[PDB]
């Protein structure tokens, strides 16, 4: 018998019969209350019989129900999610109907820690993942940046091994917004655990298909810092084309991140041992002061930092 | 004003004539930033960049004492509460009234739970979240009164009662695991002298796993970079004396690169929108890296300034952060709230105050009544309550058990 929190019809539990038989605890704020509250009637009802019931360990199933109204009057509130969670394992509560439950109240607030949290409880208890990538990409559905969401996404398919089809989401999601950076975090997330990155066919693969992204949206951040993130690894120096080939988009798509990953080509190039260090060095000095003086003002401390860093280091 | 110059017209976004929600959203954000940069020249009047602290101040002393039931969200983050007015209060140079002082403590010891740790409020279970805010609130107090209220034997066996095999800390006992909880552990356990030889053995490692390819740091191992989980794994580092677990330089570049061309502000992760409370977790980094690098003997390293432009920042928190009625705000058109208080007012001191060594060099931006007192870059606290609170947590032992 749930009457909705929200309901025409719904009753303060101080006026509930089935409740007339405990004395509710209101709250202790002290003599000279500080950040005191001024709590509504509805959530100061509720409250003061969850205190009630908290405090006598009441692990009944009117204890439970009303968990879930004090739940959607403050879903932040962790004490009563624990206490919830003693009651699902005591009264012994299908798991899979307190699954429905998770899955509404995430879908009306997915920006919350303890409702994630409780999803992954509850499918670790069940030990079954199979509603979790298809729930998942409903709410990046609706918020394809969601933090909780992607963190969940990434707890599902590395404990229940389910990589197969995320490279191939992840390319969806990357035709709705090449600009989303979640889901270049997702790519190599996959990537990094399943062929990884020294597999010269797989890198070769993801630096032309971000070379690609970058031709279309040459001013789209993301797709320059993780082509950064791939090769930074071994040294961009190690790779004698890429300067190169970019050297080339200089006229054409030739944003502050192109000038700025020249300059980060030519660091480690001289960190390197490369051949005309002079000659290197000041291309790298010039573009920092460009960048600083001009195309990058936001950043001239930064870009006088590496001008200065580089002098020191190369001089 | 760096943000009013015609210049800086140059700096809105390039679609590349390739919209997506993402360039869409940022344009939305710049329209409604532009329109308050060119609000003085609309309407003829000089820009006077004021920071209106006694509309800040009535917000926040009333606050104090008691909030409307719209904070009812905020039920189970009442030492938050607490520590973001202190500290506003304190940024602005107002007094804590010995008798409001007192106060504040007693409801404190009524949060604090008998096994040690804050809930969120009186009676809740402990929490790392609150019991982060709780200390830091007692610390910006500093009296005995204040530093008697923890129970540090119990502390430390909160501490240890979270701590994990791989490093981490869980957040609250069945609850979850991510950069927040170290942070939290490092600075109660460092300002209460509370540290044993292996509380954090394993901790300065798991942080490390949480840097990724962008080169911020992701909430767990695996995720995107984020301004608010990337403060917490740097800060945690320093107070473990562990940043160069880190790849500081990867680092450097990924949080400057969060700064805002047009808006001046930080954004929280890349591709995603400016918004005032990273004016501390975003722009707070760089003190912190200048001071690891500095460590290192980086010869490089400004004299004067931090490695980011405190001139847009100061601006954007200025011009598009403050609410009239008082208080600050995550961007212009959004609620205020004592949270963005707290960190807008925490950024701009941290924009306006340099310093390394014995190198001093402020720039307030506006009126020179702008000038905040000053915030310490790893507790978010005044200096002085850092010094106080630690020489005074000096004298007692570790505990034992
Ligand atoms: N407009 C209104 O009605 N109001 C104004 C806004 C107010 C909530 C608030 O200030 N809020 C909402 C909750 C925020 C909270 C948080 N909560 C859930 C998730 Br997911 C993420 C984060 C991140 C921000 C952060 C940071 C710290 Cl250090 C501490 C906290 Br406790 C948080 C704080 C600000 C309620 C009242
Ligand atoms: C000590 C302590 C408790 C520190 C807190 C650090 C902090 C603020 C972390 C951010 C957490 C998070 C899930 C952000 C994404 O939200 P979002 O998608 O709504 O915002 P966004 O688009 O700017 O990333
Ligand atoms: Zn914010």
Request: some cysteine.
């Given at each position: ?11 303060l539990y101080r006026?509930?019969?089935?409740w007339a ?7 202790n704020?002290?003599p000279?209350?500080?950040?005191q ?8 009802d509720?409250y003061?019989?969850?205190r ?14 009303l ?6 009057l ?8 624990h ?9 012994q509560?299908?798991?899979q ?11 009306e ?7 994630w ?27 394809a940046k ?28 990357l035709?709705?917004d090449?600009?989303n950076?979640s ?5 190599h997330?996959?990537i ?5 990155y ?18 279309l ?11 950064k993130?791939?090769?930074?690894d ?17 006229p ?11 300059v ?6 001289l960190?390197?041992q ?19 003086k ?7 401390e ?6 200065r860093?580089?002098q020191?280091?190369?001089? | 004003?760096?943000?009013l ?15 997506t ?8 954000v ?7 940069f ?32 719209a904070?009812?969200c905020?039920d189970?983050?009442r ?5 973001w ?6 940024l ?6 010995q ?6 403590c ?9 096994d040690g ?8 279970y ?17 009296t ?14 909160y501490?240890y ?6 490093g981490?800390f869980?957040?609250?006992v ?5 950069v927040?909880?170290?942070?939290c552990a ?6 209460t ?17 949480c840097?990724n ?14 301004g608010?989980y990337?403060?917490?794994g ?19 570049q990924?949080?400057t ?7 001046g ?5 890349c591709?995603?929108?400016v918004?005032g409370?990273?004016s ?9 890296l ?8 980086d ?5 004067s300034?931090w490695?980011?432009h ?12 403050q ?24 950024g701009?001191?941290?924009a306006?105050?340099?310093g390394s ?27 002085d ?13 570790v505990?034992?058990?």
């Amino acid at each position: 018998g749930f009457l909705s929190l929200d309901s025409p019809t719904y009753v303060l539990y101080r006026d509930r019969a089935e409740w007339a038989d405990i004395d509710p605890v209101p709250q202790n704020d002290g003599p000279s209350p500080v950040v005191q509250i001024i709590y509504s009637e509805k959530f100061r009802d509720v409250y003061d019989y969850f205190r009630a019931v908290l405090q006598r360990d009441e692990r009944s199933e009117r204890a439970f129900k009303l968990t879930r109204d004090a739940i959607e009057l403050n879903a932040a509130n962790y004490t009563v999610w624990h206490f919830r969670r003693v009651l699902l394992r005591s009264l012994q509560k299908d798991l899979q109907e307190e699954m429905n439950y998770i899955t509404a109240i995430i879908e009306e607030q997915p920006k919350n820690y303890q409702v994630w949290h409780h999803r992954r409880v509850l499918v670790e208890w069940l030990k079954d993942p199979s509603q979790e990538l298809e729930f998942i990409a409903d709410i990046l559905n609706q918020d394809a940046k969601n933090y909780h969401a992607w963190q969940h996404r990434q707890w599902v398919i590395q404990e229940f091994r389910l990589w197969d089809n995320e490279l191939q989401y992840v390319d969806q999601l990357l035709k709705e917004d090449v600009r989303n950076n979640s889901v270049w975090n997702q790519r190599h997330f996959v990537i990094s655990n399943t062929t990884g990155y020294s597999d010269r066919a797989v890198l070769e693969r993801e630096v032309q298909y971000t070379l690609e992204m970058i031709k279309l949206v040459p001013h789209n951040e993301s797709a320059w810092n993780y082509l950064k993130g791939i090769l930074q690894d071994r040294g961009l120096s190690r790779y004698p084309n890429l300067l190169n080939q970019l050297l080339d988009l200089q006229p054409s798509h030739s944003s502050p991140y192109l000038i700025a990953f020249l300059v980060d080509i030519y660091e480690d190039m001289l960190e390197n041992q490369c051949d005309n260090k002079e000659d290197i060095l000041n291309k790298a000095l010039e573009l920092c002061e460009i960048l600083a003086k001009e195309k990058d003002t936001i950043r001239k401390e930064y870009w006088r930092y590496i001008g200065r860093s580089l002098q020191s280091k190369h001089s | 004003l760096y943000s009013l110059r015609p210049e800086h017209a140059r700096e809105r976004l390039q679609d590349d004539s390739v919209e997506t929600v993402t360039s869409i959203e940022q344009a939305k954000v710049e329209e409604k930033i532009q329109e308050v940069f060119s609000s003085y020249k609309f309407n003829h009047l000089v820009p006077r960049l004021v920071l209106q602290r006694e509309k800040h101040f009535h917000y926040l002393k009333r606050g104090l004492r008691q909030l409307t039931d719209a904070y009812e969200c905020l039920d189970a983050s009442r030492p938050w509460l607490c520590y973001w007015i202190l500290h506003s209060l304190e940024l602005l140079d107002e007094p804590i009234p010995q008798i409001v002082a007192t106060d504040v403590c007693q409801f404190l010891e009524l949060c604090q739970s008998p096994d040690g740790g804050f809930g969120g409020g009186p009676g809740q279970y402990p929490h790392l979240a609150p019991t982060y805010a709780a200390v830091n609130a007692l610390c910006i107090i500093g009296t005995e009164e204040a530093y008697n209220v923890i129970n540090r034997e119990k502390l430390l066996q909160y501490l240890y009662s979270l701590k994990q095999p791989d490093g981490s800390f869980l957040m609250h006992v069945g609850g979850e695991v991510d950069v927040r909880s170290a942070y939290c552990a490092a600075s109660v356990a460092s300002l209460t002298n509370i540290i044993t030889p292996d509380l954090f053995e394993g901790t300065a490692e798991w942080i490390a796993r949480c840097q990724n390819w962008e080169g911020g740091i992701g909430g767990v191992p695996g995720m995107e970079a984020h301004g608010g989980y990337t403060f917490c794994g740097l800060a945690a580092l320093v107070i473990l004396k562990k940043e160069r677990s880190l790849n500081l330089k990867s680092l450097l570049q990924w949080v400057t690169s969060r700064q805002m061309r047009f808006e001046g502000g930080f954004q929280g992760r890349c591709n995603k929108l400016v918004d005032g409370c990273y004016s501390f977790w975003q722009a707070g980094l760089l003190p912190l890296l200048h001071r690891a690098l500095h460590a290192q003997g980086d010869p490089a390293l400004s004299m004067s300034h931090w490695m980011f432009h405190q001139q847009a920042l100061q601006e954007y928190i200025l011009m598009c952060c403050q609410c009239p009625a008082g208080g600050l705000l995550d961007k212009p058109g959004k609620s205020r709230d004592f949270y963005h208080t707290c960190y807008c007012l925490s950024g701009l001191s941290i924009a306006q105050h340099f310093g390394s060594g014995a190198m001093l060099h402020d720039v307030v931006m506006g009126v020179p009544e702008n000038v905040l007192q000053p915030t310490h870059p790893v507790y978010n606290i005044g200096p002085d309550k850092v010094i106080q609170a630690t020489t005074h947590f000096l004298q007692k032992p570790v505990p034992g058990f």
